[PDB]
Structure formats: structure tokens, C-alpha cells
């Protein structure tokens, strides 16, 4: 299974899906007949193999020359997140999901790439600081150009929150210097404390509708969803509730029972948290058909998540705007403006009722559940689409 969640960010027309494919080996489907060429909407998934040889892609090693094979060390999941301006809510959902980061920087293009820096700021928002700078293009640069880009990256990233960022050369086609990537992932990035102590919770980020067409309906599978666990282990034979629930505007909880837990190759009864798992339950597949189970907080029975509409939030904004090559100063919030307030994974633009310099009250059209902290991101409507302006946290 998966122990720690890892994600990759990069600018548009930069190359991350094929990079992870050279890292993991699992094809990124990039489906729906329009996402194949411009951008994606749903999240990409992949699984890496970490068997380290201490005298790699396979559990048995033959390439190094010495017949010695590698032993089991780590098996880490990878959540490909699209770095484009159109979609940000799923980016922030995955950003709250991921624990390790891989940033791409393009040489011959403009060295400050607006989406790379924007998603680096997003990384620094949600307590992510173990980031490895990757030069996604290596063959397409000269040696002097590479040195200039190295110095430019160093001078640009000196005083940010992410200070200790090792640099790695990668490509999407060659498939070389890859063991360095795995080595640095194992070294710089430890698994966050995740054991039996904290109560179990779930965050579902995607909806899978499983109804095999053409086959007789007498035997079909239920509703499976992709979820991440920040605390505790899920075991088979438990009653679970999808808390954001169904709309009967008001919403009401969904109750169900676990049928299976796909864990990275198969169906495992137990699963240490820190990896994306396929929870297949008796839920109606139509509830898993469209973008429905995207950013929903899920509870194991025996806990009572609280449904909220009015939320008191401590929020902070940065000095300047992000995601633009013109730029303007950050302006203090005004009442009666719909601003998207993503609680870790949720996608709901709230109305601002109370305005303070460092505090706010916001009302969600769709009520959402709150358990402990559930870190938040804040986006406004300025550049004809959603633009990050700051970060938010629930305080009640």
C-alpha cells in the first residue's frame, strides 16, 4: 500500500504526467475526450516502488551489474494535480491531501513561471516545506544556460518559507537519474506521525461510478470513491457516513457500510493512513457518477461531525497577487462579495458577512462539516477567474 502522499506541481505545457510515469509507471488516463490535449479536470493517480539497493523500478535488481537485488523499503503514492488557472479547487484539495512536493521549473521559458510560483505559494500555505526543485527540461538547455537557470532559481528562492529545497535534473523521455529522485524522496521527506492514537477520519476527493455497461445488471458493484486518511487505520466491517451528504438549500448525511478497500494493487483489510485508498461501499453509484464525491469529509461511525453554515475564520493575505506574469496590490476584503473558501478539500464559495483585518464570518451556500482544524485556502474573483489571495483557518 501507500505510506506517504506525494504530489507534483508545474506550469502549463511543462510536463508532469509523463514525469510521474517515468517515476511510477502507471499511465495517466486523462480521459473525457477533451482533457487529452489542453488540461485535465479530475486528479491523476500513480503508485511508486521503492526497493533500495545498498551494496528502483523492480523489487529485483539486475541493471546495476551486481546480481544483488533490492529489499522492501517504501511504497509511496503520487497524486498528479493540474497546474492551470481554470481549475484551482481540486488543486487545493490535493494540496491538502499531499505530504511531499515536487516542483517543476522550466529553463528556456520565463524563469518565473506564474503557475509554478502560485502553486509553490499554495504548498507553503498548507504546511508543506519538504519540496524538491526539479528542472523538468535538461536536454533542451546548454551548460551555460543551465548554470544561468541554476543561479536564477537560487536567487529567486532564497527567503521564502520553502528554504531547504534540493535541486534534481529530470526529463520525461530519457528515464535516467531516476534513482536520485527516489533517494531524495526517502531522505528529505519523512512520513508524518500517523498511528492508532488519533481518531479515524476520511477525506474523499473523487467519485467513481462503477456500472459495467452491457453486462447483466443482476450482479453490479456499488459506489467506490478515492479517499485520504490523515489519522487512524480503516478496517473492513465498519459503518461509515458521508457527512456532507445529499440535497433534499439544505443537505443531510449519507450512511453506508464498507464492502471493499482497494489498496494500491488489491483489496486489503487494513491500511495504515497516508495514502489514497479506494473505498467501495453500498452507496448509490449515481451519487458517485458526476463530480459529487469531490472534497467531502467522511466519518467512521462512533463520531459526530458537526454541520456548519456560519463559520468564523482567522484569515491572512499576502502582499501581492499570484498567478500573473498585469499584477496589482492585494486589496482588503469588502462585504458582499462571493469568495471561494476551500476547507482543505471542499469547493464552496462563501458570502462574507463580517469583515475584520484578521478575522471573518463567512456563510456557505452548502453546509460543511468541521471536526478539528481543516486548514483552508482563500480565492477571489479578480482576473476573470479564481485567484488565490490568502489562507484561512476555522476557529470556533
Amino acid at each position: 500500500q501507500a505510506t506517504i502522499n506525494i504530489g507534483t506541481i508545474g506550469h502549463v505545457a511543462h510536463g508532469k504526467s509523463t514525469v510521474v510515469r517515468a517515476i511510477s509507471g502507471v499511465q495517466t488516463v486523462r480521459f473525457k475526450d477533451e482533457l487529452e490535449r489542453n488540461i485535465t479536470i479530475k486528479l491523476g493517480y500513480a503508485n511508486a516502488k521503492i526497493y533500495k539497493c545498498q551494496e528502483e523500478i523492480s523489487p529485483k535488481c539486475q541493471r546495476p551489474g551486481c546480481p544483488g537485488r533490492y529489499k522492501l523499503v517504501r511504497h509511496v503514492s503520487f497524486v498528479d494535480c493540474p497546474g492551470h488557472d481554470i481549475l484551482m479547487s481540486t488543486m487545493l484539495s490535493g494540496a491538502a491531501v499531499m505530504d511531499a512536493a515536487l516542483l517543476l521549473i522550466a529553463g528556456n521559458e520565463s524563469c518565473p513561471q506564474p503557475q509554478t510560483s502560485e502553486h509553490l505559494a499554495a504548498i507553503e500555505i498548507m504546511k508543506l516545506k519538504h519540496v524538491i526543485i526539479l528542472q523538468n527540461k535538461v536536454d533542451l538547455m546548454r551548460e551555460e544556460s543551465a548554470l544561468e537557470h541554476q543561479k536564477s532559481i537560487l536567487k529567486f528562492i532564497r527567503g521564502t518559507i520553502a528554504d531547504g529545497a534540493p535541486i534534481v535534473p529530470i526529463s520525461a523521455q530519457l528515464k535516467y537519474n531516476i534513482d536520485a529522485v527516489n533517494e531524495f524522496i526517502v531522505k528529505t521527506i519523512p512520513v508524518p506521525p500517523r498511528d492508532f492514537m488519533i481518531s479515524p477520519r476520511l477525506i474523499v476527493i473523487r467519485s467513481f461510478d462503477v456500472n459495467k455497461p452491457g453486462a447483466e445488471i443482476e450482479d453490479l458493484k456499488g459506489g467506490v470513491a478515492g479517499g485520504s486518511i490523515l489519522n487512524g487505520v480503516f478496517k473492513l466491517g465498519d459503518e461509515i457516513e458521508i457527512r456532507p451528504g445529499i440535497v433534499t438549500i439544505q443537505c443531510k448525511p449519507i450512511f453506508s457500510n464498507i464492502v471493499s478497500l482497494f489498496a494500491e494493487q488489491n483489496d486489503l483489510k487494513f491500511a495504515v493512513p497516508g495514502g489514497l485508498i479506494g473505498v467501495g461501499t453500498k452507496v448509490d453509484p449515481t451519487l458517485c457518477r458526476a463530480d459529487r464525491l469531490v472534497g467531502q469529509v467522511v466519518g467512521a461511525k462512533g463520531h459526530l461531525p458537526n454541520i456548519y453554515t456560519d463559520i468564523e475564520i482567522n484569515y491572512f493575505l499576502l502582499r501581492r497577487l499570484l498567478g500573473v506574469k498585469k499584477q496589482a496590490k492585494v486589496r482588503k476584503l469588502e462585504p458582499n462579495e462571493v469568495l471561494m473558501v476551500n476547507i482543505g478539500s471542499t469547493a464552496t464559495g462563501a458570502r462574507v458577512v463580517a469583515v475584520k483585518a484578521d478575522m471573518a464570518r463567512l456563510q456557505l451556500t452548502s453546509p460543511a462539516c468541521t471536526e478539528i482544524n481543516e486548514k483552508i485556502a482563500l480565492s477571489r474573483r479578480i482576473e476573470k477567474h479564481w485567484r488565490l489571495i490568502g489562507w484561512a483557518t476555522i476557529k470556533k
Partner: peptide, 23 residues
């Protein structure tokens, strides 16, 4: 510090030139 990265970049160029002299 980006010192141990230029070494891997040099190794990358060496491998690319060795395996694909055409490109």
C-alpha cells in the same frame, strides 16, 4: 545549495549523449 545537482545534470548529459548520439 545547488552544488550536488549540477553533478547529476552532468551525468544526465553524459548518459543522453552516450545512449542517443543522434540527438
Amino acid at each position: 545549495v545547488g552544488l550536488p545537482y549540477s553533478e547529476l545534470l552532468s551525468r544526465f548529459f553524459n548518459i543522453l549523449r552516450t545512449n542517443n548520439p543522434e540527438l
